[PDB]
Amino acid sequence: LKLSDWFNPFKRPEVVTMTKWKAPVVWEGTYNRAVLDNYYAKQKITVGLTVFAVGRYIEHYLEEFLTSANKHFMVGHPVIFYIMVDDVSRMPLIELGPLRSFKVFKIKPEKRWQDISMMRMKTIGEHIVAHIQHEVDFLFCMDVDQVFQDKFGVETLGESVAQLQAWWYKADPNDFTYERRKESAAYIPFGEGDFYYHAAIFGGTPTQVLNITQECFKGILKDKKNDIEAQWHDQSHLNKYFLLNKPTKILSPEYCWDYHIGLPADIKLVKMSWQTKEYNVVR
Ligand SMILES: O=c1ccn([C@@H]2O[C@H](COP(=O)(O)OP(=O)(O)O[C@H]3O[C@H](CO)[C@H](O)[C@H](O)[C@H]3O)[C@@H](O)[C@H]2O)c(=O)[nH]1
Ligand SMILES: [Mn+2]
Ligand SMILES: [Mn+2]
């Protein structure tokens, strides 16, 4: 498969469509999903999707996330949803459609929400080694407080996939909220950086995602050891990781949009949107 076989950057001249290391940035209008569905279907791929719901997030977001995923995620290809919750008795079983199935695991609820978010890196890694590596060809790891709004398909697959954070995609690197303290493993010096990635969505082959999570958790552990916590937790470490190990594909903010921003000309068709945000329950 050649990049030119399914990707035409000339359809979106007003946004960044190719990185300096030749990785494509996928925006609505640049991909030929029909070509990709055929190619991947012929290889009979299976895609995994992990999602964590702890505490109030279960009743507030899990059902909406799973229902929408079942409807819009990798339609036409086998998908396995890996659900991690602290209380399985509340795991909202919904009806899944053709080619979708699931596997639920009960996890420990971390006291601090910051740790609930960060420990995912450890847990995902353990699961990739234990079984996911044998079950799927590609894997995505996502925040639960989001909803699929339209088709999120095979055009998003790749060795290592990153998401452009909706609020900073047009900002210059020196303005990114990377971790700036040299004392943290997530430290990124001013004068460095390609894009500001969103930890709400990342993926790739099981091998690559294993390295992403393992390296991120190592930094998370190193920081705890030195009594320091990155301001943006796992997102900060993920950004450090992606700086050192460039993603082979990046998804535009259309794949992870926050309507609080509005709806600028660049956002042509939203595939997934941030949930309200909260402000009351959840935590
Ligand atoms: O009480 C909680 C808290 C967190 N989470 C899990 O952790 C994820 C990330 O936390 P939030 O959604 O609450 O936080 P943000 O929206 O701020 O997330 C952003 O910041 C985080 C660190 O602050 C991570 O980097 C995350 O991937 C990124 O999208 C949630 O989707 C959820 O799956 C829970 O289940 N229950
Ligand atoms: Mn979130
Ligand atoms: Mn918002």
GROMACS .gro file of C-alpha atoms and ligand atoms in nm:
model
  321
    1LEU     CA    1   0.000   0.000   0.000
    2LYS     CA    2   0.132   0.342  -0.103
    3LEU     CA    3   0.044   0.669   0.067
    4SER     CA    4  -0.060   0.810  -0.273
    5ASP     CA    5  -0.305   0.522  -0.316
    6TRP     CA    6  -0.541   0.664  -0.053
    7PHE     CA    7  -0.412   1.003   0.057
    8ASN     CA    8  -0.444   1.327  -0.140
    9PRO     CA    9  -0.314   1.624   0.061
   10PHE     CA   10  -0.400   1.862  -0.222
   11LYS     CA   11  -0.764   1.843  -0.109
   12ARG     CA   12  -0.684   2.037   0.209
   13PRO     CA   13  -0.430   2.306   0.112
   14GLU     CA   14  -0.515   2.528   0.410
   15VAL     CA   15  -0.396   2.291   0.685
   16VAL     CA   16  -0.084   2.087   0.759
   17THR     CA   17  -0.119   1.757   0.571
   18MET     CA   18   0.237   1.620   0.584
   19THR     CA   19   0.497   1.640   0.862
   20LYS     CA   20   0.865   1.713   0.803
   21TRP     CA   21   0.930   1.340   0.847
   22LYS     CA   22   0.669   1.259   0.580
   23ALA     CA   23   0.395   1.131   0.809
   24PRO     CA   24   0.048   1.219   0.680
   25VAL     CA   25  -0.188   1.435   0.887
   26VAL     CA   26  -0.535   1.300   0.809
   27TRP     CA   27  -0.808   1.561   0.753
   28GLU     CA   28  -1.159   1.516   0.612
   29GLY     CA   29  -1.130   1.514   0.233
   30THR     CA   30  -0.777   1.375   0.211
   31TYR     CA   31  -0.857   1.005   0.251
   32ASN     CA   32  -1.015   0.741   0.026
   33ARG     CA   33  -1.178   0.510   0.279
   34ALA     CA   34  -1.321   0.284   0.007
   35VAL     CA   35  -0.970   0.198  -0.112
   36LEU     CA   36  -0.854   0.133   0.245
   37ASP     CA   37  -1.157  -0.074   0.350
   38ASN     CA   38  -1.091  -0.302   0.053
   39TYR     CA   39  -0.718  -0.331   0.125
   40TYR     CA   40  -0.762  -0.399   0.496
   41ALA     CA   41  -1.064  -0.625   0.449
   42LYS     CA   42  -0.855  -0.841   0.218
   43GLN     CA   43  -0.605  -0.880   0.502
   44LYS     CA   44  -0.882  -0.954   0.751
   45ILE     CA   45  -0.758  -0.715   1.019
   46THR     CA   46  -0.903  -0.685   1.369
   47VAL     CA   47  -0.892  -0.355   1.561
   48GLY     CA   48  -0.893  -0.318   1.936
   49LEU     CA   49  -1.010  -0.023   2.143
   50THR     CA   50  -0.936   0.020   2.513
   51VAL     CA   51  -1.136   0.248   2.739
   52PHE     CA   52  -1.130   0.308   3.114
   53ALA     CA   53  -1.431   0.412   3.322
   54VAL     CA   54  -1.373   0.452   3.695
   55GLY     CA   55  -1.608   0.594   3.952
   56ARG     CA   56  -1.873   0.831   3.823
   57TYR     CA   57  -1.730   0.822   3.471
   58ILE     CA   58  -1.902   0.485   3.428
   59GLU     CA   59  -2.259   0.615   3.451
   60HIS     CA   60  -2.176   0.952   3.298
   61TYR     CA   61  -1.984   0.850   2.987
   62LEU     CA   62  -1.933   0.477   2.925
   63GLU     CA   63  -2.268   0.397   2.763
   64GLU     CA   64  -2.252   0.697   2.530
   65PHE     CA   65  -1.894   0.609   2.434
   66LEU     CA   66  -1.965   0.243   2.363
   67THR     CA   67  -2.295   0.303   2.184
   68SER     CA   68  -2.136   0.560   1.951
   69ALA     CA   69  -1.821   0.351   1.902
   70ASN     CA   70  -2.029   0.050   1.805
   71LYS     CA   71  -2.190   0.269   1.541
   72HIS     CA   72  -1.892   0.462   1.401
   73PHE     CA   73  -1.561   0.290   1.485
   74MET     CA   74  -1.396   0.082   1.210
   75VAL     CA   75  -1.731  -0.015   1.060
   76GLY     CA   76  -1.696  -0.315   0.829
   77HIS     CA   77  -1.406  -0.470   1.021
   78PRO     CA   78  -1.388  -0.688   1.334
   79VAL     CA   79  -1.353  -0.475   1.647
   80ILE     CA   80  -1.291  -0.576   2.007
   81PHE     CA   81  -1.374  -0.333   2.287
   82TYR     CA   82  -1.156  -0.371   2.598
   83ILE     CA   83  -1.348  -0.220   2.890
   84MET     CA   84  -1.163  -0.141   3.213
   85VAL     CA   85  -1.388  -0.043   3.505
   86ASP     CA   86  -1.356  -0.051   3.884
   87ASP     CA   87  -1.709  -0.189   3.928
   88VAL     CA   88  -1.822  -0.445   3.669
   89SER     CA   89  -2.171  -0.464   3.822
   90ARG     CA   90  -2.234  -0.120   3.678
   91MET     CA   91  -2.079  -0.195   3.339
   92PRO     CA   92  -2.368  -0.096   3.110
   93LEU     CA   93  -2.414  -0.384   2.871
   94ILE     CA   94  -2.548  -0.246   2.545
   95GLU     CA   95  -2.624  -0.432   2.226
   96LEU     CA   96  -2.330  -0.449   1.987
   97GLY     CA   97  -2.368  -0.475   1.612
   98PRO     CA   98  -2.208  -0.701   1.347
   99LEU     CA   99  -1.833  -0.756   1.388
  100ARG     CA  100  -1.817  -0.602   1.737
  101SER     CA  101  -1.749  -0.795   2.059
  102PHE     CA  102  -1.609  -0.707   2.402
  103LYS     CA  103  -1.403  -0.811   2.701
  104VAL     CA  104  -1.444  -0.644   3.042
  105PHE     CA  105  -1.187  -0.628   3.320
  106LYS     CA  106  -1.226  -0.510   3.679
  107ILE     CA  107  -0.944  -0.277   3.784
  108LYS     CA  108  -0.843  -0.101   4.107
  109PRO     CA  109  -0.979   0.253   4.143
  110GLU     CA  110  -0.687   0.489   4.208
  111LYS     CA  111  -0.759   0.750   4.478
  112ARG     CA  112  -0.635   1.049   4.280
  113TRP     CA  113  -0.797   1.113   3.944
  114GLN     CA  114  -0.450   1.211   3.820
  115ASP     CA  115  -0.341   0.854   3.896
  116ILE     CA  116  -0.656   0.704   3.745
  117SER     CA  117  -0.553   0.873   3.421
  118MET     CA  118  -0.181   0.789   3.447
  119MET     CA  119  -0.211   0.424   3.560
  120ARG     CA  120  -0.384   0.349   3.229
  121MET     CA  121  -0.036   0.345   3.075
  122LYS     CA  122   0.066   0.059   3.305
  123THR     CA  123  -0.257  -0.141   3.268
  124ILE     CA  124  -0.273  -0.109   2.888
  125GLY     CA  125   0.085  -0.233   2.864
  126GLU     CA  126   0.011  -0.534   3.083
  127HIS     CA  127  -0.292  -0.621   2.868
  128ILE     CA  128  -0.105  -0.588   2.541
  129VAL     CA  129   0.149  -0.843   2.663
  130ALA     CA  130  -0.110  -1.074   2.816
  131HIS     CA  131  -0.353  -1.088   2.525
  132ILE     CA  132  -0.415  -0.788   2.302
  133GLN     CA  133  -0.096  -0.859   2.104
  134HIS     CA  134  -0.249  -1.190   2.000
  135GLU     CA  135  -0.597  -1.057   1.931
  136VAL     CA  136  -0.569  -0.748   1.711
  137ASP     CA  137  -0.362  -0.595   1.433
  138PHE     CA  138  -0.404  -0.234   1.543
  139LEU     CA  139  -0.512  -0.084   1.874
  140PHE     CA  140  -0.648   0.252   1.988
  141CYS     CA  141  -0.652   0.378   2.347
  142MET     CA  142  -0.910   0.643   2.429
  143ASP     CA  143  -1.055   0.864   2.699
  144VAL     CA  144  -1.411   0.765   2.788
  145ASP     CA  145  -1.549   1.121   2.811
  146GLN     CA  146  -1.594   1.157   2.434
  147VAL     CA  147  -1.854   1.058   2.175
  148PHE     CA  148  -1.813   0.936   1.817
  149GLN     CA  149  -2.014   1.168   1.591
  150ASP     CA  150  -1.933   1.017   1.254
  151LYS     CA  151  -1.721   0.753   1.081
  152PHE     CA  152  -1.382   0.692   1.245
  153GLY     CA  153  -1.235   0.431   1.011
  154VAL     CA  154  -0.934   0.256   0.866
  155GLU     CA  155  -0.798   0.586   0.734
  156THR     CA  156  -0.674   0.632   1.092
  157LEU     CA  157  -0.469   0.311   1.110
  158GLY     CA  158  -0.089   0.307   1.118
  159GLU     CA  159   0.219   0.186   1.308
  160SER     CA  160   0.197   0.469   1.563
  161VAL     CA  161  -0.094   0.713   1.554
  162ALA     CA  162  -0.117   1.047   1.738
  163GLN     CA  163  -0.397   1.302   1.786
  164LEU     CA  164  -0.362   1.678   1.744
  165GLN     CA  165  -0.508   1.848   2.052
  166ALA     CA  166  -0.797   2.068   1.934
  167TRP     CA  167  -0.700   2.384   2.124
  168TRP     CA  168  -0.337   2.399   2.012
  169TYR     CA  169  -0.313   2.272   1.656
  170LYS     CA  170  -0.242   2.622   1.518
  171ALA     CA  171  -0.004   2.732   1.796
  172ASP     CA  172   0.370   2.759   1.762
  173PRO     CA  173   0.569   2.499   1.963
  174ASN     CA  174   0.722   2.744   2.209
  175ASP     CA  175   0.368   2.816   2.325
  176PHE     CA  176   0.268   2.451   2.379
  177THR     CA  177   0.203   2.349   2.738
  178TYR     CA  178   0.468   2.076   2.729
  179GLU     CA  179   0.627   1.994   3.066
  180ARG     CA  180   0.893   2.264   3.103
  181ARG     CA  181   1.071   2.167   3.427
  182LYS     CA  182   1.405   1.992   3.365
  183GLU     CA  183   1.338   1.783   3.678
  184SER     CA  184   1.061   1.588   3.501
  185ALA     CA  185   1.110   1.294   3.265
  186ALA     CA  186   0.851   1.462   3.039
  187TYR     CA  187   1.066   1.774   2.997
  188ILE     CA  188   1.073   1.925   2.647
  189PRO     CA  189   1.301   2.232   2.601
  190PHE     CA  190   1.173   2.549   2.438
  191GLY     CA  191   1.294   2.548   2.079
  192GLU     CA  192   1.188   2.183   2.039
  193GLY     CA  193   0.861   2.014   1.948
  194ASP     CA  194   0.657   1.931   1.639
  195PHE     CA  195   0.294   1.932   1.758
  196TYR     CA  196   0.098   1.915   2.083
  197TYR     CA  197  -0.069   1.574   2.099
  198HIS     CA  198  -0.384   1.478   2.286
  199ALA     CA  199  -0.357   1.174   2.514
  200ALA     CA  200  -0.732   1.123   2.470
  201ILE     CA  201  -0.652   0.922   2.157
  202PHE     CA  202  -0.342   0.734   2.045
  203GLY     CA  203  -0.281   0.400   1.881
  204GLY     CA  204  -0.093   0.184   1.636
  205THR     CA  205   0.018  -0.178   1.623
  206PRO     CA  206   0.020  -0.363   1.958
  207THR     CA  207   0.402  -0.354   1.950
  208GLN     CA  208   0.422   0.025   1.910
  209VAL     CA  209   0.147   0.098   2.162
  210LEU     CA  210   0.331  -0.127   2.406
  211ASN     CA  211   0.638   0.090   2.366
  212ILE     CA  212   0.431   0.408   2.398
  213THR     CA  213   0.270   0.298   2.723
  214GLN     CA  214   0.582   0.137   2.868
  215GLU     CA  215   0.800   0.441   2.802
  216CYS     CA  216   0.531   0.679   2.929
  217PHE     CA  217   0.483   0.485   3.250
  218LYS     CA  218   0.860   0.468   3.304
  219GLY     CA  219   0.864   0.848   3.297
  220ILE     CA  220   0.558   0.862   3.519
  221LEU     CA  221   0.740   0.635   3.765
  222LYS     CA  222   1.066   0.831   3.742
  223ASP     CA  223   0.879   1.153   3.825
  224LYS     CA  224   0.703   0.998   4.126
  225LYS     CA  225   1.045   0.879   4.241
  226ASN     CA  226   1.176   1.237   4.226
  227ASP     CA  227   0.863   1.383   4.389
  228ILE     CA  228   0.742   1.571   4.084
  229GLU     CA  229   0.423   1.543   3.882
  230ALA     CA  230   0.387   1.677   3.529
  231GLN     CA  231   0.116   1.943   3.507
  232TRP     CA  232  -0.063   1.753   3.229
  233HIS     CA  233   0.023   1.409   3.364
  234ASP     CA  234   0.028   1.129   3.105
  235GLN     CA  235  -0.033   1.382   2.827
  236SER     CA  236   0.298   1.547   2.906
  237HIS     CA  237   0.486   1.217   2.896
  238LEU     CA  238   0.304   1.114   2.577
  239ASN     CA  239   0.420   1.436   2.414
  240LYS     CA  240   0.779   1.367   2.517
  241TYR     CA  241   0.747   1.017   2.375
  242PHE     CA  242   0.608   1.133   2.041
  243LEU     CA  243   0.884   1.394   2.017
  244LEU     CA  244   1.151   1.123   2.042
  245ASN     CA  245   0.960   0.856   1.847
  246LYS     CA  246   0.770   1.043   1.574
  247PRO     CA  247   0.423   0.905   1.500
  248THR     CA  248   0.379   0.750   1.153
  249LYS     CA  249   0.035   0.913   1.124
  250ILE     CA  250  -0.140   1.207   1.288
  251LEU     CA  251  -0.515   1.267   1.311
  252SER     CA  252  -0.657   1.618   1.264
  253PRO     CA  253  -0.868   1.785   1.537
  254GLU     CA  254  -1.171   1.667   1.338
  255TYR     CA  255  -1.107   1.329   1.501
  256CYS     CA  256  -1.119   1.478   1.851
  257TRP     CA  257  -1.305   1.809   1.855
  258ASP     CA  258  -1.415   2.033   2.142
  259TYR     CA  259  -1.719   2.238   2.043
  260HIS     CA  260  -1.633   2.482   2.322
  261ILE     CA  261  -1.391   2.620   2.062
  262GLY     CA  262  -1.666   2.679   1.810
  263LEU     CA  263  -1.646   2.538   1.458
  264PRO     CA  264  -1.379   2.704   1.243
  265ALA     CA  265  -1.346   2.653   0.869
  266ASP     CA  266  -1.075   2.387   0.920
  267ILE     CA  267  -1.315   2.149   1.101
  268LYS     CA  268  -1.507   1.997   0.807
  269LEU     CA  269  -1.667   1.685   0.958
  270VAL     CA  270  -1.630   1.587   1.322
  271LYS     CA  271  -1.568   1.216   1.384
  272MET     CA  272  -1.552   1.249   1.763
  273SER     CA  273  -1.623   1.525   2.013
  274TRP     CA  274  -1.525   1.601   2.373
  275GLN     CA  275  -1.810   1.547   2.619
  276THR     CA  276  -1.934   1.860   2.794
  277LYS     CA  277  -1.627   1.844   3.016
  278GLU     CA  278  -1.805   1.806   3.348
  279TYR     CA  279  -1.776   2.053   3.633
  280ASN     CA  280  -1.984   1.857   3.881
  281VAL     CA  281  -1.988   1.479   3.898
  282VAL     CA  282  -1.735   1.242   3.746
  283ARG     CA  283  -1.486   1.335   4.017
  284LIG     O1  284  -1.264   0.990   3.794
  284LIG     C1  285  -1.213   0.956   3.694
  284LIG     C2  286  -1.115   1.008   3.632
  284LIG     C3  287  -1.055   0.957   3.504
  284LIG     N1  288  -1.084   0.864   3.437
  284LIG     C4  289  -1.022   0.820   3.314
  284LIG     O2  290  -0.913   0.897   3.270
  284LIG     C5  291  -0.939   0.959   3.145
  284LIG     C6  292  -0.868   1.094   3.138
  284LIG     O3  293  -0.918   1.186   3.234
  284LIG     P1  294  -1.017   1.306   3.206
  284LIG     O4  295  -1.097   1.277   3.096
  284LIG     O5  296  -1.092   1.329   3.325
  284LIG     O6  297  -0.917   1.428   3.186
  284LIG     P2  298  -0.892   1.521   3.065
  284LIG     O7  299  -1.013   1.538   3.001
  284LIG     O8  300  -0.831   1.638   3.115
  284LIG     O9  301  -0.785   1.439   2.988
  284LIG     C7  302  -0.663   1.488   2.939
  284LIG    O10  303  -0.565   1.501   3.044
  284LIG     C8  304  -0.529   1.378   3.111
  284LIG     C9  305  -0.427   1.413   3.220
  284LIG    O11  306  -0.474   1.524   3.295
  284LIG    C10  307  -0.487   1.262   3.011
  284LIG    O12  308  -0.363   1.294   2.947
  284LIG    C11  309  -0.595   1.242   2.904
  284LIG    O13  310  -0.557   1.138   2.815
  284LIG    C12  311  -0.622   1.380   2.836
  284LIG    O14  312  -0.721   1.372   2.734
  284LIG    C13  313  -1.094   0.966   3.140
  284LIG    O15  314  -1.138   0.975   3.003
  284LIG    C14  315  -1.130   0.832   3.204
  284LIG    O16  316  -1.118   0.723   3.110
  284LIG    C15  317  -1.196   0.797   3.500
  284LIG    O17  318  -1.245   0.699   3.451
  284LIG     N2  319  -1.253   0.845   3.621
  285MN      MN  320  -1.092   1.330   2.865
  286MN      MN  321  -1.383   2.219   2.664
   0.00000   0.00000   0.00000
